[PDB]
Write a protein that binds this ligand. Structure first.
Ligand SMILES: O=C(CO)COP(=O)(O)OC1[C@H](O)[C@H](O)[C@@H](OP(=O)(O)O)[C@H](OP(=O)(O)O)[C@H]1O
Length: 237
C-alpha cells in the first residue's frame, strides 16, 4: 500500500527496490486537454497524484494554470523533450542564484528518433544512496540532451524503449505487457535499459479512448514517468 501523503514529495520520490508503482492516466473533462495521474490502489480506489496540461505542459499537484512542480519543454519538431522542475531558468538567473543557491534541475529528456523506431530516455544518475544526483545545467553543455550527445555517461542514465518483435499471427510489431500481446505504437511502450531488456523501468499503454495505464520502477519517480508519457502525446507520432 505505497504511501502517498505529500503529493510533491511523492512525485519526486524514486520507485522503491522491488516495488512497482501502478497508475492510470485519464484524459480530460481550442483550450488544451488536461491529463490526470492517479495511483491505482490494488484495493480498488484511485489516489490523485499529478495533473498535466499544455499551455509546454505544466505538471502540478494542484488540479484546480502556471503553478507547477514539473515542466515539459518540446522542440518545434516534437522529437526532443526536456522535463524541468520548478527551479530558476539559468538564462534568467541573478548572480546571487547562479553561484550561491540554485537553478532549475533537469529531471528527464526524451528523444524520438528499417526496423522499429527508437526512443531515448535520459535521466539523472543515482548516487550510492540511490538518490538522484541533481543536474542543474549552468549552460548548454550541461543539459541532459547535451551530455547524452557528448557521451558524458557519468551522472546520467540512458534508457530506451524495449524493442518490440514482429508477430506472424498479428502481422504487427508487438510488445508483451504482462503476457498479453500488445500492438507496438507511440501509445504502447516499455522503457528499459539496453543492458537489461528484462527489467521494465516503465510500461505505458492505452486501455481506452481517453485512458492509459502507467507503471514505473526504480530509478524513476512519478514526475519523470508522467512527463515521459505526456511527451508521447505531444510527439511527432
Ligand atoms: O526561471 C523561472 C523559474 O523560476 C521560469 O523560467 P524561464 O525559462 O526563465 O522563463 C520562461 C521562458 O519563457 C521559457 O521559455 C518557458 O518554457 P521552456 O522552459 O520549456 O523553454 C518557461 O515556461 P514554464 O517553465 O513556466 O512552463 C517560462 O517561464
Amino acid at each position: 500500500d505505497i504511501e502517498v501523503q505529500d503529493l510533491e514529495e511523492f512525485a519526486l520520490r524514486p520507485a522503491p527496490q522491488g516495488i512497482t508503482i501502478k497508475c492510470r492516466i485519464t484524459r480530460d473533462k481550442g483550450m488544451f486537454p488536461t491529463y490526470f495521474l492517479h495511483l491505482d490502489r490494488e484495493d480498488g480506489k484511485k489516489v490523485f497524484l499529478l495533473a498535466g496540461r499544455k499551455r509546454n505542459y505544466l505538471i502540478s499537484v494542484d488540479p484546480t494554470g502556471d503553478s507547477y512542480i514539473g515542466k515539459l519543454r518540446s522542440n518545434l519538431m516534437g522529437t526532443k523533450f526536456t522535463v524541468y522542475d520548478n527551479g530558476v531558468n539559468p538564462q534568467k538567473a541573478s548572480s546571487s542564484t547562479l553561484e550561491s543557491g540554485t537553478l532549475r534541475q533537469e529531471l528527464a529528456a526524451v528523444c524520438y528518433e528499417k526496423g522499429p523506431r527508437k526512443m531515448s530516455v535520459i535521466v539523472p544518475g543515482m548516487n550510492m544512496v540511490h538518490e538522484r544526483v541533481c543536474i542543474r545545467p549552468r549552460n548548454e553543455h550541461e543539459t541532459l540532451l547535451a551530455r547524452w550527445q557528448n557521451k558524458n555517461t557519468e551522472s546520467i542514465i540512458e534508457l530506451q524503449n524495449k524493442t518490440p518483435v514482429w508477430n506472424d499471427d498479428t502481422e504487427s510489431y508487438v510488445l508483451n505487457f504482462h503476457g498479453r500481446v500488445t500492438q507496438a505504437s507511440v501509445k504502447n511502450f516499455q522503457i528499459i535499459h539496453g543492458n537489461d531488456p528484462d527489467y521494465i523501468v516503465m510500461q505505458f499503454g492505452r486501455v481506452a479512448e481517453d485512458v492509459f495505464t502507467m507503471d514505473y520502477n526504480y530509478p524513476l519517480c512519478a514526475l519523470q514517468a508522467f512527463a515521459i508519457a505526456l511527451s508521447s502525446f505531444d510527439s511527432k507520432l
